[PDB]
């Protein structure tokens, strides 16, 4: 692999996959479809990794911490380039790769359900578009819409439900903001509003944040992985291609430390990326509390730049080109793998299945699962919405995948801070659980209880093993069966799930 972790660009299905999805059993025709997809490829989400590395670079230049003038120039040039590229694109914004990803996904979404949507055009069915409110999610949705309308020759353009709370009045006017199902991990919503204290959504978000902040097993496992001897040596060795031993030893013993502030000090005030308009791009001014205090921190920042570059192909142009893969060549390639583990670990423990004996890390996805089922009910009871397409985040997909027990997210780590999650003992990978444009789609047919089939990153998958399908070897499941087997006790209806 290349070890891009959760910044892995989307891998679209080849034509054989997209044309070989299973057919529903005889007598069942399509009545509904729905989706939740992560935003497509993006730039850096804020002036953070590049910011901190530039502060470190300024100190190394002042104290002679670079190994040579050529190495200094190379490092500073790459930092300046990726920062300039993100300033032009806007921090947190979708890239050309992400637009292409979602355009293809929307094309294939219409194509898989051509019958459903042609009939919906025939009899006034409506399509519901939803976003978290974050710009990159809404933009992903807009490109999905473009691809969907291209593949259907525009025949469904006048079949979109008008939002009651649109993401914006221009390109995003078709997108209902729904942070309760697409941004359930934080009290604050992307549009600046906040979830109301006392509400179910506020309770979910707040209790989650307090649990993760205060949980001793998560903190201990993450300490164990951060202090791992091989991880520490990889951090030091990666940085030793750039900085001198004196500089790095000073960093590791605590003599150097950098905050994301104007002069790198804890008290230094807000730091915005050079050339950026903070009023138009607030994300270009970083969180003042982020810091580099160890070789691990600096190396992980460098690794994050290496992996985000994989999502910035079309922006890596002109006079703001950049490259960081030269720091991960040969013997350093494996270093990336180890950083991929460390990053993945932080997500696994904080946002995914995490450790055994708890469900607080992934139960927060319950509203989304609730909506996945409720919308189907609305269609069965005679509603006219034939499709619900939602666009959100990795923070949405990780607990959603763990809650459903999707492939990759079925295995919790031991209740231990030393016997911890590893690539060897656990199936979870960020590159497969939540790549850019990661998406779950359900197709719902009916004769009788409806039946449901799932695609995950457009691979047809069974539901979790506890669920019983309509027949042996089938990927179609009774809606009653899903309501039973996706609940906390994961009870199957047994023979009653068969048709």
From TrEMBL:
Keyword line: Hydrolase, Membrane, Metal-binding, Signal, Transmembrane, Transmembrane helix, Zinc
Enzyme Commission numbers on file: 3.1.3.62, 3.1.3.80
Binding site for Zn(2+) 1: 88, 320
Chain sites annotated for binding Zn(2+) 6: 237, 335
Catalysed reactions, as listed in the record: 1D-myo-inositol 1,2,5,6-tetrakisphosphate + H2O = 1D-myo-inositol 1,2,6-trisphosphate + phosphate; (2R)-2,3-bisphosphoglycerate + H2O = (2R)-2-phosphoglycerate + phosphate; 1D-myo-inositol hexakisphosphate + H2O = 1D-myo-inositol 1,2,4,5,6-pentakisphosphate + phosphate; 1D-myo-inositol 1,2,4,5,6-pentakisphosphate + H2O = 1D-myo-inositol 1,2,5,6-tetrakisphosphate + phosphate
Highest taxon listed in the record's lineage: Bacteria
Disulfide linkage: 272-285, 467-485
Chain residues that bind Zn(2+) 3: 222, 346, 350
Binding site for Zn(2+) 2: 145, 174
List of residues binding Zn(2+) 4: 236, 245
GO molecular function, one term: bisphosphoglycerate 3-phosphatase activity
Major localization class: membrane
Annotated Gene Ontology cellular component terms: membrane
UniProt binding sites for Zn(2+) 5: 236, 295
Residue numbers binding Zn(2+) 7: 490
Cellular localisation: Membrane
Family classification: Belongs to the histidine acid phosphatase family. MINPP1 subfamily.
Record protein name field: Multiple inositol polyphosphate phosphatase 1
Organism per entry: Bifidobacterium longum subsp. infantis (strain ATCC 15697 / DSM 20088 / JCM 1222 / NCTC 11817 / S12)
Span covered, complete protein: 37 to 545 of 623
């Amino acid at each position: 692999g290349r070890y891009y972790s959760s910044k892995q660009p989307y891998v679209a299905p080849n034509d054989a996959t997209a044309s070989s999805y299973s057919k529903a059993p005889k007598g069942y025709g399509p009545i509904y479809t729905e989706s939740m997809a992560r935003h497509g490829s993006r730039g850096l989400s804020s002036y953070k990794y590049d910011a901190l590395l530039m502060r470190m670079a300024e100190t190394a230049a002042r104290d002679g911490g670079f190994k040579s003038e050529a190495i200094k120039a190379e490092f500073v040039k790459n930092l300046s380039g990726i920062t300039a590229a993100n300033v032009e694109n806007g921090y947190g914004m979708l890239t050309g790769q992400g637009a292409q990803q979602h355009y293809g996904i929307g094309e294939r979404a219409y194509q898989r359900n051509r019958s459903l949507f042609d009939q919906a055009a025939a009899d006034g069915g409506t399509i519901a578009y939803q976003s978290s409110g974050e710009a990159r999610a809404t933009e992903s949705g807009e490109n999905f819409e473009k691809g969907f309308n291209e593949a259907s020759g525009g025949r469904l353009i006048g079949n979109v439900s008008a939002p009651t709370n649109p993401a914006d009045s221009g390109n995003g006017k078709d997108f209902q903001k729904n942070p309760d199902t697409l941004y359930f991990h934080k009290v604050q919503n992307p549009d600046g509003t906040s979830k109301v204290p006392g509400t179910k959504a506020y309770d979910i978000a707040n209790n989650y944040q307090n649990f993760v902040a205060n949980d001793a097993t998560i903190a201990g496992a993450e300490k164990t992985i951060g202090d791992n001897v091989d991880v520490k040596r990889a951090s030091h060795d990666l940085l030793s291609q750039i900085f001198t031993e004196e500089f790095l030893a000073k960093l590791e013993n605590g003599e150097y430390k950098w905050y994301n502030t104007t002069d790198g000090t804890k008290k230094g005030g807000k730091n915005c990326a050079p050339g950026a308009d903070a009023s138009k791009d607030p994300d270009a001014c970083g969180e003042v509390s982020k810091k580099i205090k160890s070789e691990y921190d600096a190396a992980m920042d460098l690794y994050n730049l290496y992996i985000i570059a994989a999502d910035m192909h079309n922006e890596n142009t002109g006079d703001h080109t950049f490259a960081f893969d030269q720091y991960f060549q040969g013997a350093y390639a494996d270093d990336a793998r180890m950083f991929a583990w460390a990053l993945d670990a932080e997500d696994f423990y904080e946002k995914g299945p995490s450790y055994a004996g708890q469900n607080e890390t992934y139960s927060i996805a319950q509203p989304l699962l609730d909506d996945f089922l409720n919308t189907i009910d609305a269609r069965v009871n005679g509603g006219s919405t034939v499709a619900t397409f939602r666009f959100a985040h990795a923070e949405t997909m990780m607990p959603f995948a763990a809650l459903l027990g999707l492939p990759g997210s079925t295995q919790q780590a031991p209740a231990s801070t030393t016997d911890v999650y590893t690539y060897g003992n656990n199936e979870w990978r960020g590159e497969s659980v939540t790549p850019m444009a990661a998406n779950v789609q359900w197709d719902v047919y009916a004769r009788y209880t409806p039946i449901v089939r799932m695609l995950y990153n457009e691979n047809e998958v069974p539901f979790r093993s506890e669920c019983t399908p309509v027949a042996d070897g089938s990927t179609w499941y009774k809606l009653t069966e899903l309501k039973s087997c996706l609940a906390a006790d994961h009870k199957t209806l047994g023979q009653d799930a068969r048709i």
